[PDB]
């Protein structure tokens, strides 16, 4: 790891400085005792968020507003790191956003197939995956038409609505699996094969869990590709997938997906000359912008029973 | 006499011009990295 | 004078204490730096375990002292004013290759053990005697190269 | 002379150095791969003090195959020796080092990938060490040749 | 640099309110740290015998060149005296002008760094005696004073002793300090050629005292838990940094050689080309290659070269002086006051 | 990559060409080391002493400097507290500078006779390999202190839990550089000037 | 302003160079690479000194 | 002399060493490659042991193919041997070496794949061993030409 | 002498060894890439295993293409052979080896696709087998210029 | 003599061997690449089984382009060759080989794409082989200069 | 000519003059190119820091000036009939400011690119930037010191 700090030294030093802004398990105990959104704003400014709500009023402080200012503060940091990267890392951070724009073309089709507005639907769309053709999504509702018309110029071009979603997403995750084993060096090889495999795991389990052929729409890059793909392909009931998921020692008893993700993410920061840190920060800060939102929904309406479901390993 | 074509002066001029070509080619590789990755 | 002691013979003796020092401190650096990568992902904040988590770096500094003793012991046989044969120039070159690549092997092996192993006998203090016994076999590759060096020093 | 030149201990010194460099590159490859593999998923069930050290102590048997031949070709070295002595202890250094390089190459790959599956069932210990001594006899085959070449570096050498 | 800071000092009242730019508040809040630089560097350039690239021929030289010589022969001057204030101007243009200046500057770097290391180090005794801590004096100061003074003070008093012994009328060989240093620790006896009588019986005594101190430094503080570790990482930090700091005062020599010598080429490539008995071409040449000299000189030497020198005089203070006496941190004073805060911060 | 396996075929073919035609004693590295000027080896050992020392010193500096500038975007106090990690990267270049000053003093003009004698070839080989020893040991210690002082920068983001242990392995890399210094001072310890 | 201060330095620096060639000073015309005939190279920077005095008094009217 | 020069045992020593070195590198790629596959299987490995060790025991045979020729060349290795002898016993060691290396490349990549289907279907063993015999007679073709080069290495030498 | 030097059996020895080694490097890659596709497909059709050894058999018969010339160049090596008959003996060995190695690669790459495809159509077996024969007569083209070249060897 | 030396056959032997080796390598790439796409072609339409045989046999004439040259170079080899007929022997066949290597690269890379889309159009019986007849005469251009060199090889040597 | 002064002896000198400026200019180029891409990405939105953030390319240019001085100094000591003693001290001064000024110019490039992207998110890093930057600069000056010291032994 003597060549990493050439192009990725300032990059990793600032990403490792962003994971100290991940507010810890003591930083939620004092943050779950507010009962008003103003008070939460008052003591969220002491963190490394650092008074990001200094421009909004206090009378009109919506629950969503905190969800989108904290995510805008996430996403400006992401494309702050992204436009400072070399050709082995600018691609890797683009391949992070390629799985986001699949969830954006999956939502633009299922929003434009029904009677809905472009502007209102566009607001919900995730802004890291955003190509210039994505605001259209209205030339045709046919799946075949979209590829030639609108997806031909995208970087989704080498890759019914959920059927073409998993058809894009499996070929994406296969192409993202054999990229991180080709051009990314040794301390992030074992990371971007295991962490990525986990993402293939909890998507392939959600295939059979949402289906209750299926062998072509399931990604095969993880630990369930050789053995559990055939057992999970012919599972028609919940007990068939419950018996098929017992073969893996790391997934037995789970059928708890994000808790296993965050525990697999806290070991990703244990390496310190790897580029798996920026994925661990992205999924950790995207975790703690839905932890803050889960707390602020229990504060906006008084739901004091189910607050302690936030999950922080860092 | 070492030899008549590969004399010791040609060799010591060709080693200090192969070492300087080695630390030229690796330095051009480093500069080339900017072009390849930006 | 001697056919057996030509004037280029200290080139292979200084190439010996060069290869005995640069290679040994290369392996020492790999072991210390690579296990210090594994130390830098831990939190103890207590006494008597700081002095326990520093085993791979005080075991890697012995690899540089293994190279130190050999390089200072075959540069004490080198002087411009006495008989220095080609034979012990070849033996001192082989002493430098033996210690240099054995301490390079020990440093690579204790760096690849000590980067994950320090994260195993910390916050799980029940397999400490297995990880250290791995590091003893992982160190003594260089002590093997030092023993065959010290035979070749007193043999030539 | 012609049979015993001045540069004749170059091949002997190279052979002696060669056994340690190659043998210890392979013993470090065996030790480095086995240790990481043994401790990747076995953080649970803390009753595994002496669970899998048998690839590590057998790459140390590899490295003492290099040390035995290295001391024994260091005894045959001398200022006035033949090219034949230097040649066949270069071959007796190359065979041990290269063969035990391959031996520790085999030990490393087997150990690193075969210790992950053990964590679920401790019945792998019967068949692991059976296929893990076939890799070690590759080094003992290297030492047999070296120790038998070394038995001819004095028989009628002039 | 005096005229660059003097202008600011002369009318500081009317710069006290101004636009206050980014590199103009930094150049104004240190207007006295730039004035006192250019006055100390005017005294130093008078000791270096240094106007812009050349020498001041204002005292009688102590080097007298011989009577008659041919045009194009090597000439060796004879010393008839010592120059009163500074370097002789007889060292200007000579072929071995670097073999004297480098040795003098490199021993000046050692002497002026050891004195700054022991004046700074004495502050530690100045505040282990004020805080009423007699344990830290006998446990940290005196074991570190004996070791520092012996290892490097012994070096520092032998520059001055070799400078105070005439090694050409005594018939004795002039020693080598660098050679002498490396065989105090490696084969402590066996001097190549001695420096003063009864040398080895004290040159190994200094080593014995320093070696006795290394256990003393570490053992005394815990024995009078946590302070055993805090002391054992303080002795090995003290021992291998005194051998690092004394070798890191050579930057003064390196940056002074890389300023004097570099300027001496910047004179040659612009001004000294433009000299010749030419009427109409010359009076344009030595005007254009003067504005190619003064602009370039201010740009390179006063700004870039000068900033480089002020960041090692900032580095000598941050690590070679404040290591020894500047223990710990404190919370700053920062009282509750009223300031006319800007509206621009929004 | 193909040119490595093309200049290895040439060395095999030209070796067996000299060897099979009885002239294999023409490829003699001894007469090469004995007809070659000692000022080549001595000053390609001085210039590659300070050369590879600076190459490792700078290699350490941009590893831990570009780490603690990135780590200092949120915690700016690290760059004036973890500047000890860039001291020992730069004392590497000091150790290659001291060797250069000491080595230079052994670099004098030799006569026409007494040029390829025993002591001149000795001090040529001695300043060559000692300048490689202290140049490449300082190259490795500069890389090592850089990659372990860069883990001191992203661990001083955490307050005080690890820096007292990290420093110990920071100065363990300095000790290796110093031990490399005192080997090159003993390799050329008995080497004389050119006479 | 730039040419005023540049010519104020110019007049002072150039004239004292002309006086250190007109008096045949040892640090200027004492080498073998010297500008020979020092009182002839001196008038080149007497005229160069006073042409900076022209730029000084010409740019000193716009102040 | 001119038929039996002084560098003549260099080819024989490299040749004798090469058989052990090259054959072991094949037997180590056969052992390590096949070994990971056997270790990975655990639910049927203790039920169906002694039928997944046939790659690593066939690969091991290649090593003793190089041992039985490297002992056989080391008997004819001498100081004043002819250059023809050193030539065709470097040719013996290179033939058995790089063909045992090819037969270890085959068994290593053939054998690991077979275990994978052996865990899914127990009727793959007869289709695996038939391929893994053609991959091992490939090493024996190098042996029955190395021992045939060695049968005439001291036939009518002078 | 001049026409029959002492270093002439190096060429023949290289040829005899290269032919066996190069050809069985190609027969290794032929049984490698085919057999890795054979045992991965017989879990669905265990009755059609005996019609998938036909990529392996062809590779095994180019390995005896390499042996039947390397046993026949060994028959005429000799202490004192001419330099012509050392030159063509590497000529013959190289011709059967590097051509045979290519033949092996062709069988292996073509064979792997055929075995995997064979699970869908039993009529594809006659098409795939025919292409393979064409890619194995390349090995017999190397054997014709191995045998014919070898035959002249000892005419002078 | 100097015009007809003792090392003259080696160039000729390399020429004869090169024609067989380089062309076969080109042909093997022209066969393996062209028929690697059979599985995709026949899993949808098995009627196009008799179209993949055309780029295979067009490389088969590429392989006998080098087999004719190498058996005509072999008839002009001799112990007492001139050095001149060694260089033409090397040239004849160096060219047929490396140009049949380019013609087998071209055939095996356009017969892949010509059969990867042939299932969607039955009217490509001429347009594919019209590209093939230009890519296959690239080796015939090598042959008709390897036979003009071989006509000049032993024509006026002395 | 004679044994002391052969004809290939000013090859070392000529190569040294060329090496002193080509290797420093390659390192000063890499320093300028990475700092200039850090500046011209930094001051797109923060254009008032355009004179503080330019000190990495000034400081990387000082490496070029150091290289230039060595080339001029040893070209003053070149000559047709020069000894081979002074040939290798001109080649030692050549590749000792050469391969040290390229590594120092590289490290100014990486530290200066990290600094000018870092001293705009927080301006308190500007004092920490240059003190690291000086260290990566005087490694080229340490190369220059060796060259001056080694050129002081010509004739």
PDB file of C-alpha atoms in Angstrom, chain F residues 2-176:
ATOM      1  CA  UNK F   2       8.051  -8.870 -23.430  1.00  0.00           C
ATOM      2  CA  UNK F   3      11.469  -7.183 -23.542  1.00  0.00           C
ATOM      3  CA  UNK F   4      12.453  -8.921 -20.296  1.00  0.00           C
ATOM      4  CA  UNK F   5      12.056 -12.303 -22.007  1.00  0.00           C
ATOM      5  CA  UNK F   6      13.839 -11.013 -25.109  1.00  0.00           C
ATOM      6  CA  UNK F   7      16.994  -9.812 -23.355  1.00  0.00           C
ATOM      7  CA  UNK F   8      17.033 -13.086 -21.427  1.00  0.00           C
ATOM      8  CA  UNK F   9      17.156 -15.111 -24.628  1.00  0.00           C
ATOM      9  CA  UNK F  10      20.056 -12.949 -25.822  1.00  0.00           C
ATOM     10  CA  UNK F  11      21.949 -13.563 -22.565  1.00  0.00           C
ATOM     11  CA  UNK F  12      21.335 -17.338 -22.866  1.00  0.00           C
ATOM     12  CA  UNK F  13      22.327 -17.436 -26.555  1.00  0.00           C
ATOM     13  CA  UNK F  14      25.417 -15.255 -26.106  1.00  0.00           C
ATOM     14  CA  UNK F  15      26.383 -17.237 -23.010  1.00  0.00           C
ATOM     15  CA  UNK F  16      26.142 -20.556 -24.804  1.00  0.00           C
ATOM     16  CA  UNK F  17      27.829 -19.003 -27.851  1.00  0.00           C
ATOM     17  CA  UNK F  18      30.870 -18.059 -25.807  1.00  0.00           C
ATOM     18  CA  UNK F  19      30.705 -21.276 -23.782  1.00  0.00           C
ATOM     19  CA  UNK F  20      30.384 -23.747 -26.659  1.00  0.00           C
ATOM     20  CA  UNK F  21      33.098 -22.083 -28.730  1.00  0.00           C
ATOM     21  CA  UNK F  22      35.617 -22.287 -25.886  1.00  0.00           C
ATOM     22  CA  UNK F  23      35.587 -18.523 -25.266  1.00  0.00           C
ATOM     23  CA  UNK F  24      33.311 -18.466 -22.240  1.00  0.00           C
ATOM     24  CA  UNK F  25      36.061 -16.793 -20.223  1.00  0.00           C
ATOM     25  CA  UNK F  26      35.515 -13.630 -22.270  1.00  0.00           C
ATOM     26  CA  UNK F  27      32.422 -12.787 -20.225  1.00  0.00           C
ATOM     27  CA  UNK F  28      34.458 -11.961 -17.129  1.00  0.00           C
ATOM     28  CA  UNK F  29      32.940  -9.696 -14.491  1.00  0.00           C
ATOM     29  CA  UNK F  30      36.256  -9.491 -12.637  1.00  0.00           C
ATOM     30  CA  UNK F  31      38.177  -7.746 -15.381  1.00  0.00           C
ATOM     31  CA  UNK F  32      35.118  -5.524 -15.702  1.00  0.00           C
ATOM     32  CA  UNK F  33      35.421  -4.654 -12.008  1.00  0.00           C
ATOM     33  CA  UNK F  34      39.122  -4.050 -12.398  1.00  0.00           C
ATOM     34  CA  UNK F  35      39.373  -1.984 -15.601  1.00  0.00           C
ATOM     35  CA  UNK F  36      36.452   0.239 -14.529  1.00  0.00           C
ATOM     36  CA  UNK F  37      37.315   3.552 -12.890  1.00  0.00           C
ATOM     37  CA  UNK F  38      36.895   3.706  -9.104  1.00  0.00           C
ATOM     38  CA  UNK F  39      35.584   7.263  -9.348  1.00  0.00           C
ATOM     39  CA  UNK F  40      32.591   5.803 -11.163  1.00  0.00           C
ATOM     40  CA  UNK F  41      31.736   3.530  -8.267  1.00  0.00           C
ATOM     41  CA  UNK F  42      32.603   6.072  -5.587  1.00  0.00           C
ATOM     42  CA  UNK F  43      30.539   8.850  -7.053  1.00  0.00           C
ATOM     43  CA  UNK F  44      27.724   6.660  -8.253  1.00  0.00           C
ATOM     44  CA  UNK F  45      27.611   5.630  -4.618  1.00  0.00           C
ATOM     45  CA  UNK F  46      27.690   9.187  -3.248  1.00  0.00           C
ATOM     46  CA  UNK F  47      25.160  10.529  -5.750  1.00  0.00           C
ATOM     47  CA  UNK F  48      22.987   7.468  -5.315  1.00  0.00           C
ATOM     48  CA  UNK F  49      23.332   7.724  -1.561  1.00  0.00           C
ATOM     49  CA  UNK F  50      21.768  11.155  -1.378  1.00  0.00           C
ATOM     50  CA  UNK F  51      19.661  10.212  -4.384  1.00  0.00           C
ATOM     51  CA  UNK F  52      17.905   7.153  -3.004  1.00  0.00           C
ATOM     52  CA  UNK F  53      17.776   8.732   0.472  1.00  0.00           C
ATOM     53  CA  UNK F  54      15.881  11.741  -0.877  1.00  0.00           C
ATOM     54  CA  UNK F  55      13.711   9.404  -3.015  1.00  0.00           C
ATOM     55  CA  UNK F  56      12.650   7.559   0.115  1.00  0.00           C
ATOM     56  CA  UNK F  57      12.424  10.688   2.211  1.00  0.00           C
ATOM     57  CA  UNK F  58      10.070  12.286  -0.289  1.00  0.00           C
ATOM     58  CA  UNK F  59       8.195   9.011  -0.667  1.00  0.00           C
ATOM     59  CA  UNK F  60       7.463   9.153   3.047  1.00  0.00           C
ATOM     60  CA  UNK F  61       6.592  12.841   2.932  1.00  0.00           C
ATOM     61  CA  UNK F  62       3.864  12.623   0.351  1.00  0.00           C
ATOM     62  CA  UNK F  63       2.341   9.572   2.024  1.00  0.00           C
ATOM     63  CA  UNK F  64       1.944  10.979   5.496  1.00  0.00           C
ATOM     64  CA  UNK F  65       1.686  14.611   4.421  1.00  0.00           C
ATOM     65  CA  UNK F  66      -1.131  13.950   1.988  1.00  0.00           C
ATOM     66  CA  UNK F  67      -2.713  11.816   4.690  1.00  0.00           C
ATOM     67  CA  UNK F  68      -2.640  14.423   7.466  1.00  0.00           C
ATOM     68  CA  UNK F  69      -3.661  17.230   5.144  1.00  0.00           C
ATOM     69  CA  UNK F  70      -6.701  15.138   4.319  1.00  0.00           C
ATOM     70  CA  UNK F  71      -7.067  14.255   7.987  1.00  0.00           C
ATOM     71  CA  UNK F  72      -6.631  17.927   8.889  1.00  0.00           C
ATOM     72  CA  UNK F  73      -9.689  19.091   6.960  1.00  0.00           C
ATOM     73  CA  UNK F  74     -11.842  18.289   9.992  1.00  0.00           C
ATOM     74  CA  UNK F  75      -9.216  18.214  12.776  1.00  0.00           C
ATOM     75  CA  UNK F  76      -6.713  20.943  11.801  1.00  0.00           C
ATOM     76  CA  UNK F  77      -4.636  20.583  14.989  1.00  0.00           C
ATOM     77  CA  UNK F  78      -3.083  17.352  13.688  1.00  0.00           C
ATOM     78  CA  UNK F  79      -0.738  19.115  11.251  1.00  0.00           C
ATOM     79  CA  UNK F  80       1.034  20.886  14.139  1.00  0.00           C
ATOM     80  CA  UNK F  81       0.991  17.851  16.445  1.00  0.00           C
ATOM     81  CA  UNK F  82       1.702  15.047  13.974  1.00  0.00           C
ATOM     82  CA  UNK F  83       4.541  16.888  12.295  1.00  0.00           C
ATOM     83  CA  UNK F  84       6.860  14.481  14.105  1.00  0.00           C
ATOM     84  CA  UNK F  85       5.924  11.920  11.449  1.00  0.00           C
ATOM     85  CA  UNK F  86       7.404  14.171   8.747  1.00  0.00           C
ATOM     86  CA  UNK F  87      10.496  14.881  10.820  1.00  0.00           C
ATOM     87  CA  UNK F  88      11.714  11.276  10.671  1.00  0.00           C
ATOM     88  CA  UNK F  89      10.841  11.040   6.989  1.00  0.00           C
ATOM     89  CA  UNK F  90      13.164  13.994   6.420  1.00  0.00           C
ATOM     90  CA  UNK F  91      15.949  12.933   8.791  1.00  0.00           C
ATOM     91  CA  UNK F  92      16.267  10.074   6.290  1.00  0.00           C
ATOM     92  CA  UNK F  93      17.507  12.705   3.832  1.00  0.00           C
ATOM     93  CA  UNK F  94      19.729  14.133   6.550  1.00  0.00           C
ATOM     94  CA  UNK F  95      21.280  10.679   7.004  1.00  0.00           C
ATOM     95  CA  UNK F  96      21.901  10.521   3.290  1.00  0.00           C
ATOM     96  CA  UNK F  97      23.396  14.015   3.472  1.00  0.00           C
ATOM     97  CA  UNK F  98      25.854  13.260   6.296  1.00  0.00           C
ATOM     98  CA  UNK F  99      27.120  10.224   4.358  1.00  0.00           C
ATOM     99  CA  UNK F 100      27.635  12.464   1.329  1.00  0.00           C
ATOM    100  CA  UNK F 101      29.715  14.987   3.309  1.00  0.00           C
ATOM    101  CA  UNK F 102      31.782  12.222   4.959  1.00  0.00           C
ATOM    102  CA  UNK F 103      32.182  10.290   1.700  1.00  0.00           C
ATOM    103  CA  UNK F 104      33.215  13.383  -0.283  1.00  0.00           C
ATOM    104  CA  UNK F 105      36.209  13.929   2.015  1.00  0.00           C
ATOM    105  CA  UNK F 106      37.517  10.535   0.770  1.00  0.00           C
ATOM    106  CA  UNK F 107      37.224  11.676  -2.852  1.00  0.00           C
ATOM    107  CA  UNK F 108      40.543  13.138  -3.985  1.00  0.00           C
ATOM    108  CA  UNK F 109      42.366  13.055  -7.323  1.00  0.00           C
ATOM    109  CA  UNK F 110      44.660  10.060  -7.861  1.00  0.00           C
ATOM    110  CA  UNK F 111      47.873   9.925  -9.856  1.00  0.00           C
ATOM    111  CA  UNK F 112      48.333   8.230 -13.263  1.00  0.00           C
ATOM    112  CA  UNK F 113      50.201   5.400 -11.610  1.00  0.00           C
ATOM    113  CA  UNK F 114      48.678   4.159  -8.316  1.00  0.00           C
ATOM    114  CA  UNK F 115      45.232   4.573  -9.926  1.00  0.00           C
ATOM    115  CA  UNK F 116      44.006   0.985 -10.355  1.00  0.00           C
ATOM    116  CA  UNK F 117      45.796  -0.239  -7.235  1.00  0.00           C
ATOM    117  CA  UNK F 118      44.365  -2.214  -4.316  1.00  0.00           C
ATOM    118  CA  UNK F 119      43.309   0.669  -2.091  1.00  0.00           C
ATOM    119  CA  UNK F 120      41.706   2.716  -4.855  1.00  0.00           C
ATOM    120  CA  UNK F 121      39.588  -0.201  -6.028  1.00  0.00           C
ATOM    121  CA  UNK F 122      38.773  -0.878  -2.381  1.00  0.00           C
ATOM    122  CA  UNK F 123      37.492   2.606  -1.666  1.00  0.00           C
ATOM    123  CA  UNK F 124      35.631   2.678  -4.984  1.00  0.00           C
ATOM    124  CA  UNK F 125      33.721  -0.483  -4.110  1.00  0.00           C
ATOM    125  CA  UNK F 126      33.406   0.650  -0.520  1.00  0.00           C
ATOM    126  CA  UNK F 127      31.863   4.034  -1.230  1.00  0.00           C
ATOM    127  CA  UNK F 128      29.693   2.394  -3.894  1.00  0.00           C
ATOM    128  CA  UNK F 129      28.086  -0.257  -1.769  1.00  0.00           C
ATOM    129  CA  UNK F 130      28.055   1.850   1.383  1.00  0.00           C
ATOM    130  CA  UNK F 131      26.271   4.631  -0.490  1.00  0.00           C
ATOM    131  CA  UNK F 132      23.815   2.026  -1.751  1.00  0.00           C
ATOM    132  CA  UNK F 133      23.434   0.590   1.764  1.00  0.00           C
ATOM    133  CA  UNK F 134      22.634   3.942   3.361  1.00  0.00           C
ATOM    134  CA  UNK F 135      20.781   5.146   0.276  1.00  0.00           C
ATOM    135  CA  UNK F 136      18.445   2.217  -0.073  1.00  0.00           C
ATOM    136  CA  UNK F 137      18.077   1.542   3.642  1.00  0.00           C
ATOM    137  CA  UNK F 138      17.022   5.157   3.987  1.00  0.00           C
ATOM    138  CA  UNK F 139      14.754   4.628   0.961  1.00  0.00           C
ATOM    139  CA  UNK F 140      13.045   1.791   2.790  1.00  0.00           C
ATOM    140  CA  UNK F 141      12.943   3.530   6.163  1.00  0.00           C
ATOM    141  CA  UNK F 142      11.496   6.631   4.521  1.00  0.00           C
ATOM    142  CA  UNK F 143       8.774   4.539   2.906  1.00  0.00           C
ATOM    143  CA  UNK F 144       8.178   2.638   6.168  1.00  0.00           C
ATOM    144  CA  UNK F 145       7.980   5.764   8.366  1.00  0.00           C
ATOM    145  CA  UNK F 146       5.715   7.311   5.732  1.00  0.00           C
ATOM    146  CA  UNK F 147       3.257   4.420   5.672  1.00  0.00           C
ATOM    147  CA  UNK F 148       3.259   4.123   9.460  1.00  0.00           C
ATOM    148  CA  UNK F 149       3.041   7.874  10.037  1.00  0.00           C
ATOM    149  CA  UNK F 150       0.099   8.010   7.686  1.00  0.00           C
ATOM    150  CA  UNK F 151      -1.644   5.577  10.010  1.00  0.00           C
ATOM    151  CA  UNK F 152      -0.686   8.022  12.763  1.00  0.00           C
ATOM    152  CA  UNK F 153      -2.632  10.761  10.980  1.00  0.00           C
ATOM    153  CA  UNK F 154      -5.924   8.935  10.531  1.00  0.00           C
ATOM    154  CA  UNK F 155      -5.616   7.595  14.080  1.00  0.00           C
ATOM    155  CA  UNK F 156      -5.031  11.030  15.594  1.00  0.00           C
ATOM    156  CA  UNK F 157      -8.554  11.674  14.367  1.00  0.00           C
ATOM    157  CA  UNK F 158      -9.354   9.567  17.406  1.00  0.00           C
ATOM    158  CA  UNK F 159      -8.260  11.634  20.397  1.00  0.00           C
ATOM    159  CA  UNK F 160      -5.603   9.877  22.487  1.00  0.00           C
ATOM    160  CA  UNK F 161      -6.298   6.125  22.456  1.00  0.00           C
ATOM    161  CA  UNK F 162      -3.482   5.061  20.121  1.00  0.00           C
ATOM    162  CA  UNK F 163      -0.822   7.761  19.524  1.00  0.00           C
ATOM    163  CA  UNK F 164       1.342   6.688  22.480  1.00  0.00           C
ATOM    164  CA  UNK F 165       1.659   3.201  20.961  1.00  0.00           C
ATOM    165  CA  UNK F 166       1.905   4.390  17.360  1.00  0.00           C
ATOM    166  CA  UNK F 167       4.871   6.631  18.232  1.00  0.00           C
ATOM    167  CA  UNK F 168       6.873   3.607  19.483  1.00  0.00           C
ATOM    168  CA  UNK F 169       6.627   2.021  16.022  1.00  0.00           C
ATOM    169  CA  UNK F 170       7.239   5.428  14.476  1.00  0.00           C
ATOM    170  CA  UNK F 171      10.664   5.605  16.125  1.00  0.00           C
ATOM    171  CA  UNK F 172      11.322   1.911  15.454  1.00  0.00           C
ATOM    172  CA  UNK F 173      11.547   2.936  11.814  1.00  0.00           C
ATOM    173  CA  UNK F 174      13.990   5.697  12.796  1.00  0.00           C
ATOM    174  CA  UNK F 175      16.239   3.203  14.607  1.00  0.00           C
ATOM    175  CA  UNK F 176      16.477   1.106  11.431  1.00  0.00           C
TER     176      UNK F 176
END
